[PDB]
Design a protein around this nucleic acid. Structure first.
Lengths: 305, 109, 333, 109, 333
RNA sequence: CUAAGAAAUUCACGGCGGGCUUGAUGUCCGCGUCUACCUGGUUCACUGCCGUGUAGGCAG
């Protein structure tokens, strides 16, 4: 839950065949919990032998299309699909719709390990980069190394140790390789004080992000209101309403040595920011925590400003 | 205005990948000094003194370009500075020029 | 030890969606800058050629309806008038850990399946499946309709360990067929590579480049997408193709489906050649699911009696089970 | 919620007893007026009370199928509570209520 | 015996788009660098030349609607002013394996259909049908309206297998006529080439150059997309032309449709002119359908009474069924 | 240990036939851009040569 000993960037993590919808109320860029699970699985298959520890992620989202189409010029969109194989009766399958996108990202992390304490620097960085491209991240395989490998080997950029002015120039030595994207950070305090400031009509809580992906205007009794960025809802955690269970209590879990809880979605909003407009790059990580006293199994960006 | 300068930096970053051939050509007079932030590929025809026309690490006239953009953004009047936010527009322009100088301190290098 | 009722496996040999680009033959070995064959727009005026109903024919209504035809603006992907070839380039990888499920409840069923796949690998190698998955890269089955009528189609494969070719092989895709499986001398070294990388070790990476000399300006066939109906009867049909970076591309699942044509062991006949290895092995271009649950040769029966009941099937049809492990799926009821 | 209830005419002549009154307040228990508002003995009113107490039957421990999208969530340095999310139908239709109110009809025109 | 509910075919005669370009006669031999006929636009002004049923045809409506403007913007393509010829150049390639269907349900229907086509082929070759396709390239019908009122049309057809020329053919497309099918010793060699490419013996790629001279700065007729006569701001685009990379052109289905004008065997007339082979063989211009399903002589009756009901379709008209298979389409219920 | 695990969208098509867009018109008046300066960059770690291999007296 701490700023790292050292950062670790992976400049063109070109991925492919991702999941677009990721939640029942949006379809764009996938959930940040997919990336936190990605780095937990990377920590599981790397840092138990190389002794590091990964907590937060950094999204930059270079380019993002989606297999979507416009039906007959309506004010809506549709999805492109994939052909399911043949049913046992052999007429057609029960066709089911899901969004599948092909995005671009670069992930910076947070390390509590010995990458330059008892192991050398680019050996650890190169083995982690070479081993990262063998696993999926959002239901989609990473597009492997190609002509994009030519800027892909990286440093292992320290933060916690160095000169202060060179702390500045190391984090903006990391910013120089990160220009054409737009980073994702949460707006938790903006959620709080923007629902509480605008409580002059009703106190409802789920109507906040349900009333921001639209052009709000109280026009002239032509002046479009001051948009503060890119107001867009995100899946911001998991409320587990029903209590805990057991592997023998509810059968058909994945492993029978880990407990089961039925869960529901939660919607905060996440602004999109250029990386220049931050406090520091250690101030944008999507961490993880679980509060089993509550139902809140919620990830977060602590200290986004 | 700092977000607009960041959008200009994002435009420079987007231009910093779609330039396979970056060198002297027809239509590169203003782009000979304008190619500082839009640093093209290292010219093969350059000699051992290749850091003057194809390796120009002189992003000081980029401050002049930012000054031209600030002067041409909004017409600063001769009597719109009676309050503490009229000359503060020039202070914010100087802060944007300082951020641009820090950004282009290592543009061609 | 029973069936683990949440059971799954991952993709191994999971290729990427291949871009397409065109140029002339004998300028083929400088193919890093060929222009993208983008999807374009045209529009057709149809007619009535449907099989209309048996007693709804009405020989005046037909003339009254042919005069008002249907209007479709379908898409196309032609070559340029200068181009003569077609480049198809994708990237392929194997993830390793073949028998290991990514989802399994029973640590008893998984325990039996451990030494099942372990004594399968220790008994014999994957060289059968190595040559069978190498004859869906060594020919050019992955270009599907671009193969027929091509006058010279060939595939250039080159394995990379660093950011450079370790060992390259260059083929002639219409010499070996879509139908026969035969061993070569430029092939068994590739087979040992894909075999020893396909087991549980790590990963492998192969870039596949195919040059289908389809003709001059003649169209190619990128895969289209399913759509729901649009709210118009003039732009109703559109035949929307698939593009990656403004460039016509074949889907990943189709270009991996062409890898997956392996099994000649389905009990009907050796006439169709191989089909896609599937649980309840079914072909879209044939209509009906071969290997019915009535006959023994469907997947769950083979896997259960080769794991639970320990009665091994014959090695002729054992490879189906490991081939749709490499395919992977979601299993259980 | 769908379930498997096929007879809509048996659950369409029982909903307007609570629109304006508290006849939707006897759908779980405490059927004194629900046994007085039958005109029959305890048997038929008990059959109706069984069909009403089974209309929202909650055992506490549900079941699941292999395709329920079951997801591990990491504890703080600890074990794993695996989560199976679902699809909130009346919540999505509440979003549809607000959207169809503000997309056409009133606000669009 | 049942039929198939889903069945299809490849098209076996597949041409390209035909990009047009102008130039002067008698320097036509060096026509590798003629500039393309570029689609321009112009602004026309409409008038009243339409029928009025006299529901409002008052003594004011006509001499109001004359002064009411309906000015429009059309697209038109003229030649360069110092040019009198039109070059239309497409590539034609024949696949082969004419009757083997693409995707069919039953395994029983397809074997007797393939043997029906095979007993047709060794009964009689593709020779008459290839002659009837050759008379739609020798007679340059594929110039649709660019042929009428042309002083002299001629056709260059070379043969490409590699980047070379095997044999050439020069066809004076007005000396031989659109009306009668007659054989020439040089035309039957091209009939032999298409008859070999449709049999299966050797793939064939042909390019067809068409030098139709018209006149100095005249108006050519390329293909026209679906017009969008939309909700204008008083005067919008009312016809649009088919463009490629800065070149007007003809769709590939149009110069396929002009190439498969085969049948004279339709019962209404035989010498009035051949039409294009289709099920319920119909004309868009004539607005009718020859070979009604009231009659026997269409495709959907001959097919299921020659495959299933085993009756011979009277060899005079058996060529139609095979030509409609070479067309290819969507068959079944 | 990721709303994870998994997948052939297929087949063929004639857009097409017609046209009067004319008629007129004043872009007006005035102006201080000045002061400053070494390219002896390498405008190719360069120029013709005893032995077709650096081994040298060159306008170098």
């Amino acid at each position: 839950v701490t700023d790292p000993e050292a950062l670790l960037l992976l400049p063109r993590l070109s991925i492919q065949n991702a999941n677009a919808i990721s939640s029942p109320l949006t379809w764009g860029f996938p959930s940040p919990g997919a990336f936190t699970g990605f780095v937990h699985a990377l920590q599981r298959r790397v840092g138990i032998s190389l002794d590091i520890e990964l907590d937060g992620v950094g999204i930059v989202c270079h380019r993002f299309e989606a297999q979507i189409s416009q039906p007959a010029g309506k004010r809506t969109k549709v999805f492109n699909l994939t052909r399911n194989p043949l049913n046992r009766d052999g007429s057609t399958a029960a066709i089911v719709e899901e969004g599948r996108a092909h995005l671009e990202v670069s992930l910076l992390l947070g390390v509590h390990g010995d990458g330059l304490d008892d192991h050398p620097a680019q050996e650890i960085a190169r083995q982690v980069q070479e081993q990262a491209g063998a696993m999926r991240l959002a239901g989609g395989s990473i597009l492997p190394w190609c002509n994009e490998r030519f800027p892909a080997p990286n440093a292992e950029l320290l933060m916690l140790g160095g000169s202060d002015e060179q702390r500045r120039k190391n984090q903006r030595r990391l910013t120089r390789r990160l220009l054409p994207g737009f980073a994702l950070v949460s707006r938790e305090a903006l959620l709080q004080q923007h629902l509480e400031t605008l409580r002059t009509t009703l106190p409802e809580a789920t109507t906040l992000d349900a009333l921001l992906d639209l052009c709000r205007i109280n026009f002239e009794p032509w002046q479009v209101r001051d948009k503060p960025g890119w107001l867009v809802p995100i899946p911001a955690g998991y409320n587990a309403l029903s209590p805990l269970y057991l592997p023998g209590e509810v059968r058909n879990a994945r492993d029978r040595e880990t407990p089961l809880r039925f869960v529901e979605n939660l919607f905060g909003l996440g602004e999109w920011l250029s990386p220049h407009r931050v406090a520091a790059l250690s101030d944008l990580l999507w961490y993880h925590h679980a509060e089993p006293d509550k139902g809140l199994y919620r990830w977060s960006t602590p200290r986004f400003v | 205005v700092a977000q607009i300068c960041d959008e200009a930096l994002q435009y420079a970053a987007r231009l910093r990948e779609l330039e396979p051939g970056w060198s002297a050509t027809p239509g590169c007079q203003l782009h000979d000094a304008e190619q500082l932030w839009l640093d093209p590929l290292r010219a093969q025809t350059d000699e051992t003194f290749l850091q003057r026309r194809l390796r120009g690490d002189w992003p000081a006239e980029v401050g002049n370009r930012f000054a031209n953009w600030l002067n041409r953004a909004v017409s600063s009047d001769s009597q719109i500075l009676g309050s503490p936010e009229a000359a503060q527009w020039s202070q914010e322009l100087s802060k944007e020029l300082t951020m641009f100088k820090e950004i282009l301190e290592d543009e061609r290098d | 030890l029973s069936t683990a009722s949440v059971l799954a496996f991952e993709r191994k040999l999971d290729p990427s969606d291949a871009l397409m680009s065109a140029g002339a033959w004998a300028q083929r070995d400088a193919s890093q800058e060929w222009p993208a064959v983008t999807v374009r727009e045209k529009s057709v005026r149809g007619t009535i050629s449907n099989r209309l109903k048996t007693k709804d024919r009405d020989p005046a209504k037909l003339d009254a309806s042919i005069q008002s035809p249907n209007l479709q603006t379908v898409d196309v992907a032609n070559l340029p008038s200068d181009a003569d070839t077609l480049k198809v380039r994708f990237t392929l990888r194997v993830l390793g850990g073949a028998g290991t499920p990514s989802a399994c409840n029973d640590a008893a069923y998984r325990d039996k399946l451990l030494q099942t796949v372990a004594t399968y690998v220790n008994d014999q190698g994957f060289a059968e499946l190595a040559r069978r998955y190498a004859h869906n890269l060594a020919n050019a089955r992955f270009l599907w309709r671009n193969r027929v009528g091509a006058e010279a189609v060939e595939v250039r494969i080159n394995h990379i360990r660093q950011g450079e070719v370790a060992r390259a092989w260059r083929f002639d895709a219409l010499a070996i067929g879509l139908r026969d499986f035969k061993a070569d001398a430029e092939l068994d070294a590739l087979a040992e590579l894909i075999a020893s990388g396909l087991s549980g070790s790590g990963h492998v990476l192969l870039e596949v480049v195919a040059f289908a000399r389809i003709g001059d300006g003649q169209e190619v066939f990128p895969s289209q997408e399913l759509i729901l109906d649009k709210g118009d009867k003039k732009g109703q049909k559109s035949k929307t193709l698939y593009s990656v970076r403004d460039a016509a591309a074949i889907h990943s699942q189709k270009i991996g489906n062409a890898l997956r044509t392996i099994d000649t062991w389905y009990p009907d006949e050796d006439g169709l050649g191989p089909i896609a290895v599937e649980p309840y092995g079914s072909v879209t271009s044939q209509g009906k699911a071969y290997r019915q649950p009535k006959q023994k040769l469907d997947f769950y029966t083979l896997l259960d009696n080769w794991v639970l009941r320990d009665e091994a099937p014959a090695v002729e049809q054992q490879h189906y089970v490991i081939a749709n492990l490499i395919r992977g799926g979601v299993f259980g009821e | 919620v769908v379930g498997n209830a096929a007879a809509l005419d048996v659950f369409k002549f029982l909903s307007l007893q609570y629109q304006g009154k508290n006849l939707l307040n006897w759908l779980t228990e405490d059927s004194a007026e629900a046994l007085q508002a039958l005109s029959d003995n305890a048997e038929q009113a008990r059959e109706w009370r069984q069909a009403f107490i089974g209309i929202t039957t909650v055992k506490g421990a549900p079941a699941s199928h292999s395709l329920a999208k079951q997801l591990y969530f990491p504890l703080p340095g600890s074990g794993y509570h695996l989560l199976a999310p679902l699809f909130p139908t009346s919540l999505v239709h509440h979003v549809h209520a607000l959207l169809r109110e503000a997309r056409f009809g009133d606000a669009a025109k």
